[PDB]
Amino acid sequence: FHEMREPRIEKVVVHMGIGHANAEDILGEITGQMPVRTKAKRTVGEFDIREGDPIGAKVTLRDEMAEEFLQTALPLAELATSQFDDTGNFSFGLDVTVNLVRPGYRVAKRDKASRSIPTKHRLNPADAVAFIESTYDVEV
Amino acid sequence: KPGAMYRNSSKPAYTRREYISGIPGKKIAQFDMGNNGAGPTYPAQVELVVEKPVQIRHNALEAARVAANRYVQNSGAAANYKFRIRKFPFHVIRENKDGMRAPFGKPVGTAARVHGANHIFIAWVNPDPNVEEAWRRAKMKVTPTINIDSSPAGNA
Amino acid sequence: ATGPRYKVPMRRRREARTDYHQRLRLLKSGKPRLVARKSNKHVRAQLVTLGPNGDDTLASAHSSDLAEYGWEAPTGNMPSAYLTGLLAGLRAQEAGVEEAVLDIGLNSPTPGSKVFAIQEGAIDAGLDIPHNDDVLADWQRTRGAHIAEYDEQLEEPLYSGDFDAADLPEHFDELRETLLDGDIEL
Amino acid sequence: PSSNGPLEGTRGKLKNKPRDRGTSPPQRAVEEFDDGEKVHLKIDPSVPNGRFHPRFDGQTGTVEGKQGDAYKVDIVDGGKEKTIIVTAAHLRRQE
Amino acid sequence: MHALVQLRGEVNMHTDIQDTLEMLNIHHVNHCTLVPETDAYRGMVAKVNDFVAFGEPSQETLETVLATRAEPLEGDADVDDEWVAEHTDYDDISGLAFALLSEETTLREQGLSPTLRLHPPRGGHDGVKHPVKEGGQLGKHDTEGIDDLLEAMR
RNA sequence: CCUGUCAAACUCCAAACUUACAGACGCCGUUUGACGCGGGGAUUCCGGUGCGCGGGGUA
RNA sequence: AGUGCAAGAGCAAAAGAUAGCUUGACAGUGUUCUUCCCAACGAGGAACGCUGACGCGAAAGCGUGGUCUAGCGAACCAAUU
RNA sequence: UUAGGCGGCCACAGCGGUGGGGUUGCCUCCCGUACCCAUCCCGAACACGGAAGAUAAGCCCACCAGCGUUCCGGGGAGUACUGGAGUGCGCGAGCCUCUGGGAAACCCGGUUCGCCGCCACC
Ligand SMILES: [Cl-]
Ligand SMILES: [Cl-]
Ligand SMILES: [Mg+2]
Ligand SMILES: [Mg+2]
Ligand SMILES: [Mg+2]
Ligand SMILES: [Mg+2]
Ligand SMILES: [Mg+2]
Ligand SMILES: [Mg+2]
Ligand SMILES: [Mg+2]
Ligand SMILES: [Mg+2]
Ligand SMILES: [Mg+2]
Ligand code: NA
Ligand code: NA
Ligand code: NA
Ligand code: NA
Ligand code: NA
Ligand code: NA
């Protein structure tokens, strides 16, 4: 049963929602791989009327690239609880989000016969706190 | 203007406010009277039943209603009874007020279409039918002949 | 699901198995389809025709029943695909089938992909199929050379037990060679 | 009519019931008919092409050759003989 | 098998109704025809229902009327037993009548005009403004009902 | 939750009925030639009324 | 939701969005429907072909302008190819 | 069909939920980036290579009706409406009779947790 039920980290998105950049550079060094532009939708008063327009960057890290990052990110954060997803995710911080899930996720991300993960097989906020807390730190 | 001009249901239903503007407000003050805080938990339930399909202008509705409820003050301002007028004047009515040229009239009012045998009024009373009288006065101000019908009340 | 007005997709669309827009374009040819499908371990190839109550498969080949002819290697690779294509193609010819259009379902038209390998095989079997030569692998990779060289970077057998240690694109030739004459079920 | 375009008064006949909404099954768009076959004409709201003039919705004509992939169906409008160019998507075999 | 008698004129009657009567071989008031009880025929009589009198007659009545008002496809010739015998498959009127009722044959098949041109009802009929259920003479009738009419128009 | 009402330009529904084609019966046509084709000659393009369904209008 | 603009209709691995590439908004010539139900009538419109040349795509295929129904103009004369 | 591929009809198949199943035909999740190929950033996906592990997802199998849907019984209802007819009624609006058709809502009880086709396969 277990082993295929135990949580794991799937991508950590570090993004700097600026409002118009030079910021990529630091993201590249803080993570280790190229950042991606962040176009915006809708015209608005914050002199942000341009639809297609660089307004921030993000970086999706997977595997070691994600751990080796969290092994310094987490330490720089305190928070826990309430600040957790209903799916067992959490964002802290410049933002750093951690997407958590169990072994059979590809089933909902592939092209052929894809399918939505059953609620039971989903990750709960609690089942998440445990996994992470059980990895160099404390909850709440 | 006379009811003669609008009491018949010979014209198409004309109620789409999305295509009609300038509709006069309704003169009907209320639809729930008496103790509306309480629910129909009364022994007796009399109803005013229209005996012919007709169109009743909000004018007549208000006069009819007032004449009945204003009288139901034989029981008092805060008496124990609840009065309900179940119809609403949805049908918009016009008047061609040039002669027969470009005669589509302009909105002048609203009326409620009632089919013979429907109940336009329903009162709820304890064995104290002063309501039967309130209605003799109500069907007095609406076009059709009417039937005063009692439902829960084998207390004759 | 939600109400009377709700619109439920066609079953094969729910199952995310059939692309009906591509299907229609495929059926336009009026020719049989060369259905190229893959599995983590195997590769299938069918020649399907249209029917009153659903499709009709007139000839097929599965990477598993490849061993039935002397295959002693894994079945989820390039050489595997090609051969399965050729095997299905041959059976196809036997069935009186002369032409078909490649249907790769929900797979991607990536150059040198296995579905194209399957297509190359079917074509060599004799099947006339609309294709484009430079979207196919360069023969050597079809032979399985890319894997042999990969095992050159050995230190540990690429194949757990299986057959050989340095693998064999030669085993590939022996097989293709075999398929091109006589033998049962062809 | 307040206008005289082809789609005048076709609100009903060219609309799908909410559940038949969406791309139609390809099986019937590829159906093959033979000259002489009787076919019912009915536009499929979901299929844009290969249509015919809405006035003919309901007719049952006789397939008599084809043009491109479209078929040439012979019908009789009132008392007049007409030829309609239509695709299988909007045809059905009679009986 | 039902006996059909037109009791109302053509003036002002729907054309599709008048054409039906004509398809049933009746082209005048008081003319009568015998019609099999089939789905096809049933629909036709239903459409003519308000301008006619119909119902299943008795063996006797049919015989009386056949003898009195039957005619050859052409000519004056009286259709009596001898005629019936020397011209039809049957040996006498009764034999023909029975065959008609049992819907085994038809007036044409036996070289007879499909129409029994009756006489106005002696004593008059019950009126052509109401159906039987209302005291009138229109619509489906009783076998006893039809017989009276047919006999009065003998 | 409970409770009071509506739609010519609303519809989860839904007739009677109208309508394409085909078969069957009926009727009709093969000396009264139907169905149809080609040609000659028109008149006619102020209409009205009843009933059913209407739209406008106090009528 | 969006799909340039009335209204109604169509569309979700798309007819919408993003990106890239491209010029089929191509020449010639037709079939058919519409304009004008039935039922004759022009310009105009549309559907569906073919011949030629192309674009994209692995390919089936799609592209006869814009998802569909409005956005149009005779003879004479002039200019233009 | 002890798990597969392509489909037809396109909710009777949807939504939600329970139980069961794999040294192997198998499908998956899974493991992994030298290659073909790939991410406006990530072998996530796509693509390729492969079996250390698992049946927890998916999937297949058995089942549940609470919601949605399909069809049926009984009731609503031969009601509403309606094609044909009337020197029937009514000041009229309108109604009635005969004849041929005939509903919707809703309630109660059943049904429905897909059916079928081709191919492959201890
Ligand atoms: Cl596949
Ligand atoms: Cl057309
Ligand atoms: Mg309409
Ligand atoms: Mg004679
Ligand atoms: Mg006398
Ligand atoms: Mg009389
Ligand atoms: Mg009509
Ligand atoms: Mg177009
Ligand atoms: Mg001039
Ligand atoms: Mg010029
Ligand atoms: Mg399980
Ligand atoms: Na004027
Ligand atoms: Na009165
Ligand atoms: Na559809
Ligand atoms: Na034209
Ligand atoms: Na960019
Ligand atoms: Na499983």
What brief labels describe this structure?
5 chains; A: 140 residues; alpha+beta; 50s Ribosomal Protein L5, Chain: A; 5-stranded antiparallel sheet; 5 strands; D: 5-stranded antiparallel sheet; globular; binds chloride ion; binds magnesium ion; RNA-binding; Large ribosomal subunit protein eL21 (chain D)
Compile the SSE list and pairings.
This is part of a larger assembly, with chains A (140 residues), B (156 residues), C (186 residues), D (95 residues) and E (154 residues).
Chain A: E1 8-16, H1 24-31, E2 36-37, E3 57-61, H2 64-73, E4 90-92, E5 95-101, H3 125-133
Antiparallel strand pairs in A: 1-3, 1-5, 2-3, 4-5
Chain D: E1 38-41, E2 60-67, E3 70-77, E4 80-86, E5 91-93
Antiparallel strand pairs in D: 1-2, 1-5, 2-3, 3-4
Chain E: E1 2-6, H1 15-23, E2 31-35, H2 39-48, E3 52-55, H3 59-69, H4 81-87, H5 93-101, E4 116-117, E5 139-140, H6 143-152
Parallel strand pairs in E: 3-5
Antiparallel strand pairs in E: 1-2, 1-3, 2-4
Helix pairs in contact in E: 1-2, 3-5
The structure holds chloride ion (2 copies), magnesium ion (9 copies) and sodium ion (NA) (6 copies).
The site of one sodium ion has 5 residues of chain B, from loops.
Chain C binds three RNA strands through α1, α2, β1, β2 and β3.
Largest interface: C-D, 14 and 11 residues
Structural class of chain C: alpha+beta
Shape of chain C: globular
Major beta sheet of chain C, specifics?
Answer: 4 strands, mixed
Biggest sheet strand line-up of chain D:
4-3-2-1-5
DSSP E strands of chain D, number: 5
CATH class type of chain C: Alpha Beta
Per the principal axes of the C-alpha atoms, what is the gross shape of chain D? Answer: globular
Helical/strand content category of chain D: mainly beta
Largest sheet of chain D: 5 strands, antiparallel
Organism (chain A): Haloarcula marismortui (strain ATCC 43049 / DSM 3752 / JCM 8966 / VKM B-1809)
Pfam family, one (chain A): Ribosomal_L5_C
Subunit structure (chain A): Part of the 50S ribosomal subunit. Interacts with protein L18 and the 5S rRNA, and probably with tRNAs. Forms a bridge to the 30S subunit in the 70S ribosome.
Family (chain A): Belongs to the universal ribosomal protein uL5 family.
